[PDB]
Amino acid sequence: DLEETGRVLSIGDGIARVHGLRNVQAEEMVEFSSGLKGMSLNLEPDNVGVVVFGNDKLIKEGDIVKRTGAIVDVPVGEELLGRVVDALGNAIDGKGPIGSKARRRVGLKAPGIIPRISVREPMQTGIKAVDSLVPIGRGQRELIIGDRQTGKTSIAIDTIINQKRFNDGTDEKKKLYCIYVAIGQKRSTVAQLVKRLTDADAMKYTIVVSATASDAAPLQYLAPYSGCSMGEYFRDNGKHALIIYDDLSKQAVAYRQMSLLLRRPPGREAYPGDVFYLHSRLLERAAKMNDAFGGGSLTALPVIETQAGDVSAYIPTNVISITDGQIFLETELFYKGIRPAINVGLSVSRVGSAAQTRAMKQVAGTMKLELAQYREVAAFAQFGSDLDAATQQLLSRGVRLTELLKQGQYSPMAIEEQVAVIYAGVRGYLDKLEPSKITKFENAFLSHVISQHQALLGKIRTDGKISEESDAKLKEIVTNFLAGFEA
Amino acid sequence: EVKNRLDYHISVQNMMRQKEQEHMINWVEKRVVQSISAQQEKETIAKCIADLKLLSKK
Amino acid sequence: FAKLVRPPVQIYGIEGRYATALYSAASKQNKLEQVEKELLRVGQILKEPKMAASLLNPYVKRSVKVKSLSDMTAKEKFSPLTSNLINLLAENGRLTNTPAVISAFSTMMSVHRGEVPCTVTTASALDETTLTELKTVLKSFLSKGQVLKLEVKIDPSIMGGMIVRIG
Amino acid sequence: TTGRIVAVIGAVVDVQFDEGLPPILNALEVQGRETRLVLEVAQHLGESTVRTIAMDGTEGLVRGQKVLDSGAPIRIPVGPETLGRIMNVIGEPIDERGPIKTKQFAAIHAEAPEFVEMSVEQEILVTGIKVVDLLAPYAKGGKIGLFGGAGVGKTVLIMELINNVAKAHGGYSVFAGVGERTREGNDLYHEMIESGVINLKDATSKVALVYGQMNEPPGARARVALTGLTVAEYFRDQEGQDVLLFIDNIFRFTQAGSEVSALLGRIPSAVGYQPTLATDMGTMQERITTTKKGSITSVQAIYVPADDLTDPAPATTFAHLDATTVLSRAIAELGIYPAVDPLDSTSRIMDPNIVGSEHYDVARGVQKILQDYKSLQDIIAILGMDELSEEDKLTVSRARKIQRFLSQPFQVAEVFTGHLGKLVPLKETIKGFQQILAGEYDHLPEQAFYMVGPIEEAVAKADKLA
Amino acid sequence: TTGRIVAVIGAVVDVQFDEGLPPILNALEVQGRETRLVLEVAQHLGESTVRTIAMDGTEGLVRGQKVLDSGAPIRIPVGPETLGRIMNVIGEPIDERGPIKTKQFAAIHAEAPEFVEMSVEQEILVTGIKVVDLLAPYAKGGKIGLFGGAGVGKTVLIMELINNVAKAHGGYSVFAGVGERTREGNDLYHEMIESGVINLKDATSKVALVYGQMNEPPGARARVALTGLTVAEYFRDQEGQDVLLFIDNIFRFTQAGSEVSALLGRIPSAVGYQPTLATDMGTMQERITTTKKGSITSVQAIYVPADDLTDPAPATTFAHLDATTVLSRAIAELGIYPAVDPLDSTSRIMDPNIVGSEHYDVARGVQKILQDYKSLQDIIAILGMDELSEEDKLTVSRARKIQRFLSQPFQVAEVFTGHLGKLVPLKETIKGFQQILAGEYDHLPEQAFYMVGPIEEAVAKADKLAE
Amino acid sequence: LDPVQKLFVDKIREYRTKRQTSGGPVDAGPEYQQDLDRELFKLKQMYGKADMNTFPNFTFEDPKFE
């Protein structure tokens, strides 16, 4: 009845000093009268400093605080693959609730060394630039960084679309289950987004954990942890997961704020310190696992949107140092229209080689380096004036290759297409052409192969990798095609 | 061009049923409630389940 | 210093940080009860202004307020350590606060072993209950009183609202 | 129910309401208020005490004084009868024209609509200003934030927007003078009257004016926005409206919140800014939308705090901005009213993937060309056009035509433009510039494009000359 | 003695002991938390209540719970069996191969060894890597902090050193992966495993690994520091050893301290810090030494928040060091690895004496040229050229060659670099730059100097770079 | 009522009454109806206006081969 209940000792600021229920199991989400849950974070003796899920407007004091007697868990399952939920795994989709009714403590930890297994994986993005230059393997926490839906977000889509190929393929590792933790992203933003993902029907292998620009702060805050709990499920259940946290900048904000409101200070940048732990605890749980975990993965794509490219920015520094690289995107370039827009100098996978795909590596590995120089002379050299043809070419060629790393948004690829177009540049074929025509070339080039060199694609696909032979066929394609492509 | 033509009807029958549901429901609940306590046995069913707490939660 | 002794209820301390002193103090020397009754007495022995309201009047010198409010009067038979704690709450101004210490206290030898569950209407009514057995039901029967819609309601006691609450 | 003044430390009025503590957000009207002083429950501090906020002035706060719960948040007129009317925050004729009655009054806490309940997919509200739509596509339900040179007929323009849009579109308007200069609003008042955008004769104006000027205490200044919202939702859903919500000036919101926070025992985070800044912001932002029926499109005067926009507050704001407007003196100087510098008239949601490619491209061509022409403004500044070729001449000329062509005359500031204004549907608009791009009208007078709304009247006008 | 947890406000665990409080620092075993929840007494809060700290986290705790003093501070397994193992604080097998069965136990506390009991003035441990030794020669048994933004190949670099050096080194080593990505530690593990130096067949290795990862609750990360110390001390003195002590990252440690400082009911500090930072460190760093009984050359990786050094914590840090490796984010940013700011990475320990003057001087000229050279760099940067002095040009270029010459690619990590470019034994190093000082090389390239080893080969590369 | 199904009954017979009125369940009344009238009309705005109770028929043509 009210058998064992407690009275809201005080309330103001969404911080419910709660009298009673005293023997609360720690970090129990409890329930107040108001429907509302809170989680009893703070056990002071005489009261519970209670972080309130939902908000204090509702609230009236002395109100019954019921144990919920439950420690924070979030629902876990897979029926959310095909769903949008709020952070508590309750829908918001309005389809009624998810079939996923299993729950799982978000209070979980990142596995040990032995559990884990290192990468050697590729992990395909369908974004050429990305898998090539910031080559991706599965399990990895890596920073997606870019400045104000500068297509930042777009990226995630192309990859997801790329995972389509896997989940729509049959992948036993590449079948990357996407968990989209949407942090702070306004309802419109999300609503909008979702609408697309569903359209991308990628939603089927996709969870969307949703903290829009409406949430109570812990909720926004919580959302990743929710996601965190879930993705490890796949990972550990062999299944290969992808989580997009977008973005922790907001989460942190909420969280600091949460502290602050809790009249708990912060440190640096007004941010508390173990927000480092926050991200660590959050992110370390994304990993590439040993076989005991079905080998699986939770590949973590945290997103931090640089604020003004600022990263020295303590929390960014933090995240950066956690991530095994960053993909910084050159937003002005984006704005130059360049989509992708990348700041590849500022895009790194320190890793590099464990994370790549041989098909691509065969042209791209080599290219990356070569580009290292092109780019290098794009920047290094910088006048009006010409150098030598080599470099001049490198610039021209490079520039061509630049188009190639673009990808009019929402258009990822399977590996051979990428490699294909790349072959064309690397192997000298389209140094020739111009950007205006690159883009065109590619279109044509694809329809050409699409029609024709499906064989070859077949091959490349087969080996997952190039063959000189395939190359020889390629060689022909490009040359000939190239000729067809203009004339 | 056909589809729009059927879908109004569906979508209206969906919205209509909710608007009958909420209005039924609200009017329904707002009429009948009170007579409940004059069943003291709504506190006897509290006592009943409460005696099957009171034996049967120990 | 001492070591912890706390009569059943027991409390949380804090304006009962004193209570707890005597939840060890009274308790020890087991004039637990002497004082237990003292307190009761005190309560109304207290309640009227005088040399008490004295304090309020800031300008009355606490120093001698104790020697007046407690000298002749609060030692009228409130003394053991009882006047001294009076004279402590006195100093420590916890005099206006004292009722609550009694409150707090008084659930003590009896009510020390109180009755809690939060239960509709005039809910529990601090008594005593033995958790192994039911005690609950009994009580209810005793009465066919309280108020339960005005007093605690069919929403708690049996969800009048809940059926609303699903939607 | 009653409250006592238990503590006044300013307008944080510690009220002890002792007949329970009505949920935070409840409006109380304080009893003993000659100056009907509403307190909003902010915290239930306990002790049957709440911390409450004056949204009004004080004195004669004779202690223990009696305070009355209205049992709800502040209730304010909702319903159409507000149009043409200026109410204070607390929903009362500061038009000083007797009751701004409505039919329904509303407790003004009412927040963040469900994501599904929107038509989750939003759509440009057609302004008709060529430049406007073109450069910053304005979304029904959206937040567009108006950065802009001062007094430049920001207002003039705005008035005109009401005319074209709130008129031509079903657009209604709300003016929320948040912390504005009462005086400018006064001036404006007369201006509005004058402009006829507001009308008295009939109060069937498109705009209800709500002012919660500098005069208000922050809570009031802060809150005039929810109020304004509360109506706008009313119209939006209820009157199905595309409401135009002029929230003028949002900075004053931020400012109002931020101030209180500290005092409010809330850490007002970075820069002083209320730690909730975003949440405040968010909860509010989520109320701005094309729901299903109606859109509340927020036309946001945005003072550029510290002209700084990394400025956490603006940073947040960015999230809230679909389309961003900086009004530009540079342009203005060119006599071009619109004074819009278009490069600052964007929508983040620009793309051809998003803002689709003719528009975009024509535009791309335009921003580029105009700039390129601007590159030439430096280049020409040296070399003269003589040293440039006709594509440059062309571009210049076109750019220039285009330049003029963004100029659309004004009924209002016949003083600035020189005359009565127009209206321009989009197809014609883009076509217009596209046409100029086709160079069609040779470079038959380009000053023709000056202060002409549709492109044709200029073509025609070029002819009357030629 | 027993307490019951009375307040849990996070992993600051307030235990009210209902009777006797053992002195502060007693490791307590919580009666209930099988999640071996050591609480370390932190404060005697008064009235038999202690503030104790969970190392661990807390969810599920009933406010109530009984805590039984483990009766001492932490006892940890010590001795050699910790070599080739992953120990946490408690020396548990994060090797995950079962225990780290020792004889010896330890209070993870240890204190500063007597000043006289130290060695007084140490002797250079050369650092191999040309740039490095040259400008920063180290002392055998030295404490070096490597300031550097983590993870910039920062971490890579340390590993590479380890590679060169720790390999080159015999003795033993202690490795503490604190707060670092478990993921990297995982790889590393396997890498060591692989290396077989993490012997897969010795419980030992030659290296003990101690971990206090980021994802941990603070106490664990915090305290692993003492632990690691205890072990290394164990080896240093007891095993008489030349221990190498690798720490990544003290920054996270320091941070851990600071983070708690507030929660600890203390004031945090400037920037939030632990205001006790200094005492903590002073005492800690003084726990560190190379006494007579052995020597610990401790290579301590330092993440420097936002690379702010200025930032008081690093400001403090400096005291503790006697060799600093200050990495230039800019140089690193030039890709240039070596990336160091070496006019900031310092040792007074470079000497005309100890390092002989040649080296030394060669360096002084270098330090100098470069030091001047930066100064302009900026001016000229915008202020372009020539209506100037071209002797300067000479230095600039030269500086640049030298600059490049410091660079050596990440030899091993072809995965990161694809490049090799070796280590330079010291005379060859001195020679190298000295030769550049002789400036003969100067009609030559610039990236020849970049990412290599022996100046001869670099020269070779110069020629070659000259096509 | 809390033989709980009697609260379902409590509701249900008022469903029984309401559904055993006309329109099935009504008493929603004209105010509901104006609301309906808008959204039902407003639907048509998105959606076109003709054969929402019959079949629409269509036509097939060409301009020129440009």
D65: CATH:
2.40.10.170
Contact E279, E226 (CB under 8 A): no
Please, what sign has the CA dihedral across residues C107, C111, C114, C115?
negative
Q: Which domain holds residue A380?
A: 357-487
Query: Are residues A376 and A276 part of one domain?
Result: no
The C-alpha of C165 sits at a distance from chain A's nearest C-alpha, in angstroms, of 9
The C-alpha of B58 sits at a distance from chain F's nearest C-alpha, in angstroms, of 24
Which of D326, D400, D342, D327 lies closest to D156, judged by CA? Answer: D327
Catalytic residue, chosen from E140, E181, E400, E422, is E181
Strand partners for E358: none
Query: Are residues D275 and D243 part of one domain?
Result: yes
Which of E238, E213, E190, E200 lies closest to E84, judged by CA? Answer: E200
Chains in contact with F, where contact requires at least 3 CB pairs less than 8 Å apart:
B, C, D
The set of long-range contacts for A449-456, using a CB threshold of 8 Å and a minimum separation of 24, is A449/A417, A449/A420, A449/A477, A452/A477, A453/A477, A456/A416
Identify all chain D residues contacting F42, using CB atoms and an 8 Å cutoff.
240, 293
Query: Are residues E337 and E229 part of one domain?
Result: yes
d(CA A80, CA A98) in angstroms, rounded, equals 6
Phi, psi of D225 (to 5 degrees): -65, -45
Which of E295, E284, E340 lies closest to E130, judged by CA? Answer: E340
Domains contained in chain F, CATH given: 1-48 (6.10.280.200)
Q: Which amino acid is at A161?
A: I
Which of D99, D44, D47 lies closest to D77, judged by CA? Answer: D99
d(CA A178, CA E134) in angstroms, rounded, equals 51
Query: Are residues E453 and E327 part of one domain?
Result: no
Which of A301, A353, A297 lies closest to A173, judged by CA? Answer: A297
Number of independent structural domains in chain A: 3
Residue A246 in marked binding region: yes
Q: Please give the C-alpha separations between residue D261 and each of A57, A379, D12, D258, D277, in angstroms, as whole numbers.
A: 16, 48, 11, 5, 10
Query: Are residues D146 and D108 part of one domain?
Result: yes
Q: Cβ contact (<8 Å) for A284 and E252? A: no
Query: Are residues E425 and E292 part of one domain?
Result: no
Which of A449, A447, A442 lies closest to A425, judged by CA? Answer: A442
Query: Are residues A256 and A169 part of one domain?
Result: yes
Query: Are residues E360 and E322 part of one domain?
Result: no
Strand partners for E12: E9, E53
Pairing of strands D295-301, D242-248: parallel
The residue written with tokens 């021209």 in the block is A396
Token pair, residue D365, equals 């061509």
Query: Are residues A91 and A30 part of one domain?
Result: no
Query: Are residues D278 and D223 part of one domain?
Result: yes
Task: Assign A31 to helix, strand or coil.
Answer: strand
Q: What share of chain E is helix, strand, coil (3-state, %, to 5)?
A: 35, 20, 45
Cβ neighbours of residue E372 closer than 8 Å, sequence gap 6 or more = E395
Contact E208, E177 (CB under 8 A): no
Residue E194 in marked binding region: no
Cα nearest neighbour of F13 on chain B: B28
Query: Are residues A170 and A104 part of one domain?
Result: yes
Of D22, D115, D276, the CB nearest to A190: D115
d(CA E173, CA E246) in angstroms, rounded, equals 8
Query: Which secondary-structure segment (H or E) carries E125?
Result: strand E124-125
Residues of each annotated binding site of D for ADP: 151-156
Q: Which domain holds residue C99?
A: 16-107
What count of other Cβ atoms lies within 10 Å of the Cβ of residue E414?
Answer: 13
Rounded to 10 degrees, the C-alpha dihedral E268/E228/E302/E347 comes to 120
Residue E156 in marked binding region: yes
CATH number at residue D265: 3.40.50.300
Find the length of chain B. Answer: 58
Rg, chain A, Cα only: 25
F38 interfacial to chain D (CB closer than 8 Å): yes
CATH number at residue A46: 2.40.30.20
Token pair, residue A79, equals 């029926």
Query: Are residues A317 and A195 part of one domain?
Result: yes
Query: Are residues E390 and E275 part of one domain?
Result: no
Contact A91, D115 (CB under 8 A): no
d(CA A480, CA A444) in angstroms, rounded, equals 12
Among E302, E327, E349, the domain boundary falls at E349
Q: Which domain holds residue E28?
A: 1-73
Query: Are residues A257 and A330 part of one domain?
Result: yes
Query: Are residues A75 and A221 part of one domain?
Result: yes
Query: Are residues A232 and A379 part of one domain?
Result: no
Half-sphere exposure of residue E136, counting CA atoms within 13 Å on the CB side? 24
| Alpha helices in D101-217, H assignment, sequence order | 130-135, 154-161, 168, 182-195
Contact E232, E296 (CB under 8 A): yes
What count of other Cβ atoms lies within 10 Å of the Cβ of residue F41?
Answer: 11
Task: Assign D225 to helix, strand or coil.
Answer: helix
The residue written with tokens 């049992």 in the block is D71
Q: Please give the C-alpha separations between residue A43 and each of A15, A50, D222, D324, E62, in angstroms, as whole numbers.
A: 13, 8, 35, 46, 9
C163 interfacial to chain F (CB closer than 8 Å): yes
d(CA A124, CA D297) in angstroms, rounded, equals 41
The residue written with tokens 């909003």 in the block is D40
Contact D166, D205 (CB under 8 A): no
Task: Assign E13 to helix, strand or coil.
Answer: strand
Number of independent structural domains in chain D: 3
d(CA E437, CA E197) in angstroms, rounded, equals 41
Q: Please give the C-alpha separations between residue E454 and each of B2, E130, E422, E446, E457, in angstroms, as whole numbers.
A: 81, 9, 7, 15, 5
CATH number at residue A405: 1.20.150.20
Query: Are residues E193 and E119 part of one domain?
Result: yes
Q: Cβ contact (<8 Å) for F14 and B8? A: no
A285 interfacial to chain E (CB closer than 8 Å): yes
Cβ neighbours of residue D213 closer than 8 Å, sequence gap 6 or more = D177, D178, D179, D180, D181, D182, D185, D221
| Alpha helices in D199-239, H assignment, sequence order | 218-233
Strand partners for A102: A76
Among D349, D369, D386, the domain boundary falls at D349
d(CA A274, CA C135) in angstroms, rounded, equals 49
Contact E451, E421 (CB under 8 A): yes
C-alpha D5 chain-centroid distance: 38
d(CA A286, CA A244) in angstroms, rounded, equals 11
Which of D224, D282, D272 lies closest to D252, judged by CA? Answer: D224
CATH number at residue C87: 1.10.520.20
Task: Assign E231 to helix, strand or coil.
Answer: helix
Task: Assign E454 to helix, strand or coil.
Answer: coil
What single-letter DSSP state applies at residue A299? E
d(CA E60, CA E70) in angstroms, rounded, equals 21
d(CA D369, CA D362) in angstroms, rounded, equals 10
Q: In A231-372, at which residue ranges do the beta strands (DSSP E only) sit?
A: 240-246, 297-305, 325-328, 347-349
Pairing of strands A102-105, A5-12: unpaired
Half-sphere exposure of residue A2, counting CA atoms within 13 Å on the CB side? 26
Contact D373, D396 (CB under 8 A): yes
d(CA A58, CA A14) in angstroms, rounded, equals 10
Query: Which secondary-structure segment (H or E) carries E173?
Result: strand E172-178
Query: Are residues E363 and E337 part of one domain?
Result: no
Task: Assign C88 to helix, strand or coil.
Answer: helix
The residue written with tokens 């009220």 in the block is D15
Q: How far apart are the first and last CA of chain A?
A: 84
Query: Are residues E435 and E317 part of one domain?
Result: no
Contact E430, E366 (CB under 8 A): no
d(CA E277, CA E295) in angstroms, rounded, equals 25
Q: Phi-psi bin for E92: left (phi > 0), alpha (psi -120 to 50), beta?
A: beta
d(CA E181, CA D42) in angstroms, rounded, equals 44
Instruction: Please indicate whether chains D and F are in contact, defined as at least 3 beta carbon pairs under 8 Å.
Output: yes
Cα nearest neighbour of B47 on chain C: C137
Burial letters for A345-362: b for 16+ Cβ neighbours within 10 Å, e otherwise?
ebbbbbbbbbbbbebbbb
Contact F13, F7 (CB under 8 A): no
Cα nearest neighbour of A7 on chain C: C118
Query: Are residues A272 and A367 part of one domain?
Result: no
Which of D451, D454, D458, D446 lies closest to D415, judged by CA? Answer: D451
Of A10, A269, A409, the CB nearest to D45: A10
Which of A371, A391, A390 lies closest to A382, judged by CA? Answer: A391
d(CA C81, CA C86) in angstroms, rounded, equals 8
CATH number at residue D448: 1.10.1140.10
The set of long-range contacts for A470-478, using a CB threshold of 8 Å and a minimum separation of 24, is A471/A423, A471/A427, A474/A420, A474/A423, A474/A427, A475/A427, A477/A445, A477/A448, A477/A449, A477/A452, A477/A453, A478/A423, A478/A424, A478/A427, A478/A429, A478/A430, A478/A445
Among D18, D49, D73, the domain boundary falls at D73
Cβ neighbours of residue A296 closer than 8 Å, sequence gap 6 or more = A173, A234, A235, A236, A237, A238, A239, A240, A241, A289
Among A28, A49, A70, the domain boundary falls at A70
Contact A460, A453 (CB under 8 A): no
Cβ neighbours of residue A378 closer than 8 Å, sequence gap 6 or more = A394, A395, A398, A399
Which of E249, E104, E103, E109 lies closest to E175, judged by CA? Answer: E249
Residue E233 annotated to the active site: no
d(CA D214, CA D248) in angstroms, rounded, equals 12
d(CA D131, CA D452) in angstroms, rounded, equals 12
Query: Are residues E113 and E3 part of one domain?
Result: no
Chains in contact with C, where contact requires at least 3 CB pairs less than 8 Å apart:
A, B, E, F
